[PDB]
Amino acid sequence: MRSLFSDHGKYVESFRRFLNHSTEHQCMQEFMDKKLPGIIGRIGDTKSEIKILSIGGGAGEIDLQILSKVQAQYPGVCINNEVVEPSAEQIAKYKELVAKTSNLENVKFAWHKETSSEYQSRMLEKKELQKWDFIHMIQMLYYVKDIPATLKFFHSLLGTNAKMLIIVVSGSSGWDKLWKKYGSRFPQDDLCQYITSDDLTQMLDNLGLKYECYDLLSTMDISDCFIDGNENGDLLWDFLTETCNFNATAPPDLRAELGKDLQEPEFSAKKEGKVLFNNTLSFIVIEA
Ligand SMILES: Nc1ncnc2c1ncn2[C@@H]1O[C@H](CSCC[C@H](N)C(=O)O)[C@@H](O)[C@H]1O
Ligand SMILES: CN(C)CCOC(c1ccccc1)c1ccccc1
Numbered sequence: 001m002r003s004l005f006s007d008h009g010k011y012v013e014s015f016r017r018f019l020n021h022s023t024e025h026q027c028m029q030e031f032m033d034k035k036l037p038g039i040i041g042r043i044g045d046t047k048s049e050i051k052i053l054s055i056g057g058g059a060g061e062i063d064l065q066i067l068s069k070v071q072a073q074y075p076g077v078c079i080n081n082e083v084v085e086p087s088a089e090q091i092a093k094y095k096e097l098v099a100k101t102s103n104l105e106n107v108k109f110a111w112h113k114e115t116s117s118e119y120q121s122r123m124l125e126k127k128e129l130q131k132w133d134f135i136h137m138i139q140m141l142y143y144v145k146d147i148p149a150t151l152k153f154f155h156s157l158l159g160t161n162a163k164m165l166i167i168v169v170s171g172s173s174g175w176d177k178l179w180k181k182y183g184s185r186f187p188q189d190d191l192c193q194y195i196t197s198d199d200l201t202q203m204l205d206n207l208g209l210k211y212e213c214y215d216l217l218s219t220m221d222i223s224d225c226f227i228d229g230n231e232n233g234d235l236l237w238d239f240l241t242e243t244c245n246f247n248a249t250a251p252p253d254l255r256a257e258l259g260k261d262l263q264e265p266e267f268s269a270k271k272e273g274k275v276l277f278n279n280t281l282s283f284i285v286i287e288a
Helices: 008-019 024-034 061-073 088-099 116-124 147-155 174-185 197-207 231-241 252-261
Strands: 049-055 078-084 107-112 132-138 158-169 211-216 219-221 268-271 274-278 281-287
Touching (some): 024 061, 061 088, 116 147
Parallel strands (some): 132 158
Antiparallel strands (some): 158 281
C-alpha cells in the first residue's frame, strides 16, 4: 500500500474533501470567535508592534481569522505576521489570499519556506533570540520530528505576556482510537507521526511549562463512505486511512473490519442516518 502522502495530487484532493466534509474549520472558527479574544487580549499591551509567528501556516485561511481578532483587540497597531511554511505551493496560495482580502493594510507579511526545525537552526546561529507575542502551531506537529525540542524552543521565543497556541486532534477523538487499533496496518512514511493532545500534555508536564488544554467537538461527515462507488465516500476513505485508493488496494479483510468499526460509537456517532466521525480537536495555550 502507498501512503496518501506520496501523491500530492491525491493528498490534496483527499484533504479538500475533508475540509468540505467536516466541521474542522468551523470548529476552529468557533474557538477563534468565543475563545481567542480572551487568549490574545493582552499580548499587545505596551507594544507598538504585535509580532505573530505562524508555524505551518499553510494557505493562510486560519491565520487571517487569527489576524482579524488581534486587530479587533488592538486598533491601528502594526502587526508583523511571519510564516514558517516548507511548501512553496502553500506560500503562493497564502500570498494570493492576502492580496484578495481587505482590511489587512496594517499587517506586514513575511514567508519563510523552510520547516520549523530549519527555522530553529537558522535562528540559533544568529546568537540573538528574537521575541514574539503570539506563536501558533495549528494541525502541523504531526510533521515535526522532535516535538519536545520544538515546544521548548518556540516557548523560549515568547515575549512578555505572550502566548503559544497549539492545535492537534484530541486523545478522545476517533483518530486516536483509529491510530491505536489500525495504525500499524496503515502505510508508514517518516514524513509524519501520530500525535494527540495526550502526547503533548505529557510532554508539556515533563517540560514544566504552564498551559491549559481545551477540547471542542468536531465531526467528519463519513456518511458517503458507506455508498459503494460513491465519489465523496472513497475520497474520504483515502484520507481517513492515509492510503492511496483504499477501497480498492487494501486487503478485503482490513476493509471489512475498519468499515464496521467506523460505525461503532468509539469512532463515530450515527445521527439522522448521517455517520459522523469523531474529529474532536484540542486547543492548548502555553504561557511565556
Ligand atoms: N516540519 C514542518 N514545519 C512547518 N510546517 C510544516 C512541516 N511539515 C509540514 N508543514 C506544513 O504543515 C501544514 C500542515 S496542514 C496545516 C493547516 C494550517 N495550519 C491550517 O490550519 O489550515 C502544511 O501547510 C505543511 O506544508
Ligand atoms: C489532522 N487531522 C486532519 C486528522 C487526520 O490526521 C492525519 C492525516 C493528515 C493528512 C492527510 C491524511 C491523514 C495524520 C496521518 C498520519 C500522521 C499524522 C496525522
